[PDB]
């Protein structure tokens, strides 16, 4: 088990770390069918998604996908600094795998 | 997958974008049977619903419909500026498909 | 579909609207068996419940009854003005069907 | 159905009201097996638990037990004044049945 | 039943109490498959995990694992002082069993 997001990120293929050190600029959420997902942006336009649950996900990720969306919404509303995101870069928007926040 | 609420909204029939750039003026919620829903309004009078779950919804939307009502409650209480809504315009009130929030 | 709490409330037998325009004075909730409920009061004396779930309720209302208790707790803690309540008046305390909040 | 926490407390055996009129001093929660529970204390030393769900509880209490842990956490973090607790006094620490909160 | 975290912690094999008396320095959470977890650090460099749900865990712990992650996230965002952690020391990072918070 990893001790930090950078290390956890590197346990997967098709990942990269984005270092933001900034609050979220915009939070978007959708309940439209086949687009049950969230999208966030930062002030420079970099855009990220929490993917729609799909075949690529294993069952244990389902709860976690819901929690991440909970996280992003509260982070946005509290203007919390996001340190890093670990993302899969084989999707557009890059798909969030993990988030770190630090003051 | 879309990168933003406008493009997402364009993936569906019977939808349009409202551009509000304003906080929620009122939040209403009901537990009355066949009316388990939320309704919001803006100061310009525009009124939107989170629809009662119905036969038009697919199963993957049920959790996202609960999430949206969570989101609208917290956005209301935090006076968060709603940027745009993507809504179905074949329902009265217009039915929320997606929301975007930015400063 | 109604557009506001007053019209929604009138879709049911045994309901009325109370107009508070005040924050919640006290919040009470219970885990005791057969009294899994919430009770709120206002400074004017008015007291309301969220009913214990029972067979008077259809299944779709179960989640909304939970949500309503969430809403009342957070509105209490945030000192949010409650505008109106739709209640059933064939219970004592009057049973909450819907709430509206506005500045 | 009762109108207040004292009357509700009186519908059960082995209970009493404690009047705190104070915020919670400490919040403790555990995920260890067989000790899935919450413990709070007040500055006067008084200590209370939300019991581990057990065979004494009826199905309808399960969700209310989770909700009470939620309520205690948020009451702690927001330094909400706890007015009264209804507890069962045949457990040690005394076990929370109900809570009231007021300015 | 125990009345505080130290005594609770002592009812299990392979645990220890860490005393932090400090806010959380960073919160990380992951939805990557097999790494559905949270990791927190403090400014003293100490690092702790909420374990991925696993076969070691009994059924009653699953809800409490989710609750813990909720607790850590909101502790972080409110800059709540963490008093103590009870951890299992047979995992790297040490795995959270229980948390106490006090001003
Ligand atoms: C910590 C750990 O177990 N890491 C392993 C992961 C992991 O088991 C799977 O990602 C969990 O589903 O599986 C890795 C990986 O890099 O993802 N893996 C996966 C596979 C074949 C199946 C596969 O690619 N699953 C990942 C799909 C990806 O799912 C992602 C979401 O979880 C994203 O949607 C991404 O865009 C998609 O490519 N072969 N190796 C190997 C890596 O060592
Ligand atoms: C991104 C994507 O998958 N978009 C597609 C959507 C989508 O698959 C469905 O809406 C998901 O249920 O289905 C589309 C759509 O526009 O909704 N679709 C669906 C259909 C036939 C069935 C249909 O109209 N289902 C949606 C009914 C609408 O449900 C909405 C709620 O989700 C609202 O209640 C709206 O008022 C109602 O008309 N014809 N086209 C085509 C579009 O390309
Ligand atoms: C918008 C809508 O569908 N409104 C209709 C409602 C509604 O279908 C049911 O209340 C939902 O269960 O059912 C109405 C109603 O007024 O409640 N209805 C239902 C009935 C027969 C059964 C009945 O009275 N169910 C409601 C019981 C009430 O449940 C309420 C909780 O939901 C309260 O506990 C109230 O104290 C209790 O009397 N007769 N009229 C007719 C109304 O037009
Ligand atoms: C409003 C209401 O229905 N009140 C009744 C309650 C109630 O039905 C049960 O407590 C719900 O499970 O059941 C009462 C009660 O006082 O608890 N009751 C129940 C019984 C036999 C079974 C019994 O004692 N159940 C309660 C056990 C208590 O559970 C509590 C958790 O809910 C605590 O853990 C407590 O320490 C324990 O003694 N005898 N009286 C009588 C009371 O009038
Ligand atoms: C209050 C109480 O019931 N305490 C008892 C606990 C408890 O029943 C179990 O931990 C609940 O799963 O079980 C104890 C314990 O110390 O864990 N126990 C359990 C066992 C054999 C099975 C066992 O080791 N289960 C715990 C494994 C641990 O699970 C933990 C998560 O819950 C951690 O992942 C930890 O790293 C791992 O070693 N031997 N003693 C004895 C202790 O008296
Ligand atoms: Ca700070
Ligand atoms: Ca204001
Ligand atoms: Ca205000």
Numbering used by the authors:
A (entry chain D), B (entry chain C), C (entry chain B), D (entry chain A), E (entry chain E): 1 to 103
List passages from the publication reporting this PDB structure.
Binding has been described as a “two-fingered grip”, provided by the two terminal residues, galactose (Gal) and sialic acid (NeuAc). The specificity of this interaction is mainly determined by the terminal galactose residue, which is buried in a deep pocket at the rugged underside of the toxin (distant from the A-subunit). As expected, all three inhibitors bind in the primary binding site, acting as decoys for the toxins’ main receptor, the GM1 ganglioside.
Compounds 2 and 3 are bidentate ligands that combine the two terminal residues of the GM1 oligosaccharide, i.e. galactose and sialic acid. Both CT variants have well-defined electron density for inhibitor 2 in all binding sites. As in the other structures, the galactose moiety of 2 is buried in the GM1 binding site, H-bonding with Glu51, Gln61, Asn90 and Lys91. The sialic acid residue has direct interactions with the backbones of Glu11 and His13. The differences to GM1-os binding can be seen in the linker region of 2, where the hydrogen bond of the core Gal to the side chain of His13 is no longer achievable. Instead, closer to the terminal Gal, the carbonyl group of the linker engages in a water-mediated interaction to Asn14.
